[PDB]
Design an enzyme around this catalytic site. Structure first.
Site, PDB file in Angstrom:
ATOM      1  N   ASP A  71       0.852  -1.175   0.000  1.00 27.50           N
ATOM      2  CA  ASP A  71       0.000   0.000   0.000  1.00 27.50           C
ATOM      3  C   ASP A  71       0.886   1.222   0.000  1.00 27.50           C
ATOM      4  O   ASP A  71       2.101   1.112   0.207  1.00 27.50           O
ATOM      5  CB  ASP A  71      -1.069  -0.011   1.126  1.00 27.50           C
ATOM      6  CG  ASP A  71      -0.508   0.214   2.527  1.00 27.50           C
ATOM      7  OD1 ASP A  71       0.689   0.524   2.704  1.00 27.50           O
ATOM      8  OD2 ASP A  71      -1.313   0.090   3.476  1.00 27.50           O
ATOM      9  N   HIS A  84      -2.994   1.191  10.777  1.00 28.69           N
ATOM     10  CA  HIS A  84      -3.771   2.131   9.970  1.00 28.69           C
ATOM     11  C   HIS A  84      -4.911   1.404   9.266  1.00 28.69           C
ATOM     12  O   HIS A  84      -4.796   0.218   8.967  1.00 28.69           O
ATOM     13  CB  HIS A  84      -2.890   2.944   8.984  1.00 28.69           C
ATOM     14  CG  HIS A  84      -2.115   2.119   7.987  1.00 28.69           C
ATOM     15  ND1 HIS A  84      -0.779   2.319   7.711  1.00 28.69           N
ATOM     16  CD2 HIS A  84      -2.506   1.109   7.170  1.00 28.69           C
ATOM     17  CE1 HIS A  84      -0.402   1.446   6.760  1.00 28.69           C
ATOM     18  NE2 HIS A  84      -1.406   0.672   6.378  1.00 28.69           N
ATOM     19  N   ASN A  93     -10.339   0.067   0.789  1.00 29.84           N
ATOM     20  CA  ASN A  93     -11.051   0.860   1.782  1.00 29.84           C
ATOM     21  C   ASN A  93     -11.720  -0.066   2.783  1.00 29.84           C
ATOM     22  O   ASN A  93     -12.146  -1.173   2.429  1.00 29.84           O
ATOM     23  CB  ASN A  93     -12.075   1.763   1.122  1.00 29.84           C
ATOM     24  CG  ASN A  93     -11.437   2.858   0.353  1.00 29.84           C
ATOM     25  OD1 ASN A  93     -11.230   2.735  -0.845  1.00 29.84           O
ATOM     26  ND2 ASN A  93     -11.074   3.925   1.034  1.00 29.84           N
ATOM     27  N   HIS A 119     -10.035   1.087  17.657  1.00 28.38           N
ATOM     28  CA  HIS A 119      -9.847   2.420  17.067  1.00 28.38           C
ATOM     29  C   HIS A 119      -9.845   2.362  15.538  1.00 28.38           C
ATOM     30  O   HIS A 119     -10.604   3.078  14.874  1.00 28.38           O
ATOM     31  CB  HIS A 119      -8.534   3.047  17.557  1.00 28.38           C
ATOM     32  CG  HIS A 119      -8.231   4.385  16.957  1.00 28.38           C
ATOM     33  ND1 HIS A 119      -8.486   5.586  17.568  1.00 28.38           N
ATOM     34  CD2 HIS A 119      -7.645   4.704  15.769  1.00 28.38           C
ATOM     35  CE1 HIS A 119      -8.061   6.570  16.764  1.00 28.38           C
ATOM     36  NE2 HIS A 119      -7.536   6.094  15.645  1.00 28.38           N
ATOM     37  N   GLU A 120      -8.992   1.507  14.984  1.00 29.27           N
ATOM     38  CA  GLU A 120      -8.883   1.362  13.542  1.00 29.27           C
ATOM     39  C   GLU A 120     -10.194   0.952  12.899  1.00 29.27           C
ATOM     40  O   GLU A 120     -10.488   1.382  11.791  1.00 29.27           O
ATOM     41  CB  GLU A 120      -7.783   0.369  13.167  1.00 29.27           C
ATOM     42  CG  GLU A 120      -6.415   0.715  13.732  1.00 29.27           C
ATOM     43  CD  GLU A 120      -5.893   2.087  13.315  1.00 29.27           C
ATOM     44  OE1 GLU A 120      -6.459   2.743  12.416  1.00 29.27           O
ATOM     45  OE2 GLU A 120      -4.887   2.507  13.900  1.00 29.27           O
ATOM     46  N   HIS A 123     -12.401   3.678  12.134  1.00 28.39           N
ATOM     47  CA  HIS A 123     -12.052   4.292  10.859  1.00 28.39           C
ATOM     48  C   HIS A 123     -12.701   3.542   9.693  1.00 28.39           C
ATOM     49  O   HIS A 123     -13.228   4.171   8.769  1.00 28.39           O
ATOM     50  CB  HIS A 123     -10.525   4.336  10.685  1.00 28.39           C
ATOM     51  CG  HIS A 123      -9.837   5.326  11.573  1.00 28.39           C
ATOM     52  ND1 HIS A 123     -10.230   6.637  11.720  1.00 28.39           N
ATOM     53  CD2 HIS A 123      -8.742   5.185  12.364  1.00 28.39           C
ATOM     54  CE1 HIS A 123      -9.395   7.235  12.573  1.00 28.39           C
ATOM     55  NE2 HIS A 123      -8.459   6.404  13.003  1.00 28.39           N
ATOM     56  N   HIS A 129     -10.910  11.194  13.541  1.00 29.85           N
ATOM     57  CA  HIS A 129     -10.391  11.449  14.869  1.00 29.85           C
ATOM     58  C   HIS A 129     -11.181  12.463  15.671  1.00 29.85           C
ATOM     59  O   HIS A 129     -11.698  13.451  15.147  1.00 29.85           O
ATOM     60  CB  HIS A 129      -8.910  11.816  14.822  1.00 29.85           C
ATOM     61  CG  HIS A 129      -8.014  10.646  14.558  1.00 29.85           C
ATOM     62  ND1 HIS A 129      -6.872  10.707  13.793  1.00 29.85           N
ATOM     63  CD2 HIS A 129      -8.147   9.342  14.912  1.00 29.85           C
ATOM     64  CE1 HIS A 129      -6.360   9.469  13.697  1.00 29.85           C
ATOM     65  NE2 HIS A 129      -7.094   8.584  14.357  1.00 29.85           N
TER      66      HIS A 129
HETATM   67  C1  LIG Z   1      -2.205   6.628  12.740  1.00 31.77           C
HETATM   68  C2  LIG Z   1      -3.389   5.646  12.840  1.00 31.77           C
HETATM   69  N1  LIG Z   1      -3.142   4.711  13.965  1.00 31.77           N
HETATM   70  C3  LIG Z   1      -3.065   5.357  15.282  1.00 31.77           C
HETATM   71  C4  LIG Z   1      -3.973   4.608  16.273  1.00 31.77           C
HETATM   72  C5  LIG Z   1      -3.870   5.118  17.703  1.00 31.77           C
HETATM   73  C6  LIG Z   1      -4.851   4.585  18.698  1.00 31.77           C
HETATM   74  C7  LIG Z   1      -5.685   5.453  19.398  1.00 31.77           C
HETATM   75  C8  LIG Z   1      -6.577   4.979  20.337  1.00 31.77           C
HETATM   76  C9  LIG Z   1      -6.648   3.624  20.597  1.00 31.77           C
HETATM   77  C10 LIG Z   1      -5.823   2.740  19.910  1.00 31.77           C
HETATM   78  C11 LIG Z   1      -4.929   3.225  18.964  1.00 31.77           C
HETATM   79  C12 LIG Z   1      -1.621   5.298  15.757  1.00 31.77           C
HETATM   80  O1  LIG Z   1      -0.934   4.300  15.534  1.00 31.77           O
HETATM   81  N2  LIG Z   1      -1.166   6.367  16.400  1.00 31.77           N
HETATM   82  C13 LIG Z   1       0.195   6.414  16.915  1.00 31.77           C
HETATM   83  C14 LIG Z   1       0.770   7.803  16.785  1.00 31.77           C
HETATM   84  C15 LIG Z   1       0.754   8.371  15.418  1.00 31.77           C
HETATM   85  C16 LIG Z   1       1.323   9.728  15.556  1.00 31.77           C
HETATM   86  N3  LIG Z   1       1.350  10.470  14.313  1.00 31.77           N
HETATM   87  C17 LIG Z   1       1.339  11.802  14.270  1.00 31.77           C
HETATM   88  N4  LIG Z   1       1.282  12.498  15.409  1.00 31.77           N
HETATM   89  N5  LIG Z   1       1.378  12.438  13.100  1.00 31.77           N
HETATM   90  C18 LIG Z   1       0.234   6.051  18.389  1.00 31.77           C
HETATM   91  O2  LIG Z   1      -0.709   6.335  19.124  1.00 31.77           O
HETATM   92  N6  LIG Z   1       1.385   5.532  18.820  1.00 31.77           N
HETATM   93  C19 LIG Z   1       1.756   5.102  20.064  1.00 31.77           C
HETATM   94  C20 LIG Z   1       2.874   4.282  20.170  1.00 31.77           C
HETATM   95  C21 LIG Z   1       3.276   3.774  21.412  1.00 31.77           C
HETATM   96  C22 LIG Z   1       2.558   4.091  22.550  1.00 31.77           C
HETATM   97  C23 LIG Z   1       1.446   4.910  22.459  1.00 31.77           C
HETATM   98  C24 LIG Z   1       1.049   5.413  21.215  1.00 31.77           C
HETATM   99  C25 LIG Z   1      -4.721   6.393  12.888  1.00 31.77           C
HETATM  100  O3  LIG Z   1      -5.665   6.001  13.621  1.00 31.77           O
HETATM  101  O4  LIG Z   1      -4.839   7.400  12.179  1.00 31.77           O
HETATM  102 CA   LIG Z   2     -12.062  -3.644   1.859  1.00 34.78          CA
HETATM  103 ZN   LIG Z   3      -1.238  -0.631   5.205  1.00 35.35          ZN
HETATM  104 ZN   LIG Z   4      -7.060   6.914  14.141  1.00 30.31          ZN
END
Ligand SMILES: C[C@@H](N[C@@H](CCc1ccccc1)C(=O)N[C@@H](CCCNC(N)=[NH2+])C(=O)Nc1ccccc1)C(=O)O
Ligand SMILES: [Ca+2]
Ligand SMILES: [Zn+2]
Ligand SMILES: [Zn+2]
Ligand SMILES: [Ca+2]
Ligand SMILES: [Ca+2]
EC number: 3.4.24.17
Length: 168
Positions: A71, A84, A93, A119-120, A123, A129
């Protein structure tokens, strides 16, 4: 809460999912549970229903991968981006991808797969968000002291219901 621009959403209430592959971190059953629970979270507050598939294309294809994985959005190794997913729609999608470079635990010692999956999936259903920090759809994952105190915020509910309505 915020939805995706254009407000894309499934034009059907029954979606199929398919866990394409598994992470070695947890036994297949701990993975399966995490995602069934994940979906259950949304199923309980809307007229949405889900059925699992083992073959073919499901609406929500779920898989674990690292770095380049097929991707335009490669995973970044340990930490940072954990996973993601894509908003409702055809093909890729609705799919959710989990960075296997994380340590998927079934508790809060590493990266809890249940929460991230929850969370995902938000989406995959059309939720973007939230600005509320107590909302599942909030931008950042954070180490929950308790997995037993978790519940969708009224915000996450307001959003999903504005899209698919309350459960009949
Ligand atoms: C990026 C993607 N995935 C997020 C999910 C975070 C989440 C939130 C609530 C419950 C479960 C999961 C993700 O992976 N976020 C990362 C940070 C991305 C930062 N990017 C940016 N600021 N531009 C995340 O939360 N990471 C993390 C890693 C270790 C410990 C805690 C958090 C999305 O949802 O757009
Ligand atoms: Ca699909
Ligand atoms: Zn992917
Ligand atoms: Zn998200
Ligand atoms: Ca990562
Ligand atoms: Ca891993």
């Amino acid at each position: 809460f915020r939805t995706f621009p254009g407000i894309p959403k499934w034009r059907k209430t029954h979606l199929t999912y398919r866990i394409v592959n598994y992470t070695p971190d947890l036994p297949k059953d701990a993975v399966d549970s995490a995602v069934e629970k994940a979906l259950k979270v949304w199923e309980e507050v809307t007229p949405l229903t889900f059925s699992r598939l083992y073959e073919g294309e499901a609406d929500i294809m779920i898989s674990f991968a690292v770095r380049e994985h097929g991707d335009f959005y490669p995973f970044d190794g340990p930490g940072n981006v954990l996973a993601h997913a894509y908003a409702p729609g055809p093909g890729i999608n609705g799919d959710a991808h989990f960075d296997d470079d994380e340590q998927w635990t079934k508790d809060t010692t590493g990266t809890n797969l249940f929460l991230v999956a929850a969370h995902e999936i938000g989406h995959s259903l059309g939720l973007f968000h939230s600005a509320n920090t107590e909302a599942l759809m909030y931008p950042l994952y954070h180490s929950l002291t308790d997995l037993t105190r978790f519940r969708l915020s009224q915000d996450d509910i307001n959003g999903i219901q504005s899209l698919y309505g309350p459960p009949p």
